[PDB]
Design a protein around this nucleic acid. Sequence first.
DNA 1: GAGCGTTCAGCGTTCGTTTATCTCCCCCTGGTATAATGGGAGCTGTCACGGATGCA
DNA 2: TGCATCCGTGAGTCGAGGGTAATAACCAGGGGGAGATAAACGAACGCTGAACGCTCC
Lengths: 48, 77, 73, 48
Amino acid sequence: LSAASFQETTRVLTDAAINAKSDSLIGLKENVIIGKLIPAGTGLSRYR
Amino acid sequence: EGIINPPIDELLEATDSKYSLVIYAAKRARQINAYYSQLGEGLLEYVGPLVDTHVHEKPLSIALREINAGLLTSEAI
Amino acid sequence: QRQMLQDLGREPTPEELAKELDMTPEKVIEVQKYGREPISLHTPLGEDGDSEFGDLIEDSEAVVPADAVSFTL
Amino acid sequence: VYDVLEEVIAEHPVLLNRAPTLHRLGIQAFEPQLVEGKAIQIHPLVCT
DNA sequence: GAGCGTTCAGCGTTCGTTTATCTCCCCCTGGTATAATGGGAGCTGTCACGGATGCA
DNA sequence: TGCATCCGTGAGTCGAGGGTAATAACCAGGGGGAGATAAACGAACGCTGAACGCTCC
């Protein structure tokens, strides 16, 4: 998901479908897509 | 008469971090607002403002004032 | 209508067009309204390349927040 | 309305922001304060 | 009882109802019998980078 | 094995704003929904007073 949101959006979509890659949602750019809390600063498990 | 009225250096040393402080003041501010919205139920678990309050005030402003006194206590789970 | 423009040298009025068709002017006005074509939403305005026509028209089905809370009140 | 308005804005920050926003000091919160006219007054130190 | 006083009554008496019939234009389909027999047509110039893909 | 070629990708930021063209054309038949008139019941009225009581001579 983060790779798709970068420059390539066809090759990354195409090979992910072939490879069948499940995206674990840990990270920053992909947690902005879904609307969840970014794991950075106040969004951490310990602070929140 | 400003945002900077409770100084930040005094607040910082109480909580030992910076991100810890903002959520800690915010969690308390949520509680005190919820207390004001009982409107007659008077549920036991909520607790009102510990410090005196102006005629009009923001609940977050009250929360930061409580930290400077240091009566309020936070604990990470 | 093309023949009338060439012959009379002026844009014909719908009423004069109507008698040639033998129908009534209201039918002429009606058929003119059906004879258009839609314009594509995904088209550039032309002032700038990035802007698209589809990002300039608002929907009505959205629930306006002020009205919804007033009904509850 | 104007009398009521000054009562509610107090102690409520607003995030100013300039368009390119190269580095994280591009977005900075401030304490608002009403002023006539139609232009945001800003503090000369924070210009750079 | 006189004379009229209130109020059920069930009964007609057609008027109430909704529910059943029945007549009509848009809309879709099919058909024309001299002979007719391979498109117009719109382009083109950024720049670097890289890796596939062709070929000496 | 090396050299030549072409194809795909990317190239800032917020401001301002709405419409585009053209060729046989008909009876002929006929289906199918969209709008126009008499029959089943029960409810307002209607006089039918009749049948009960409410005061009055």
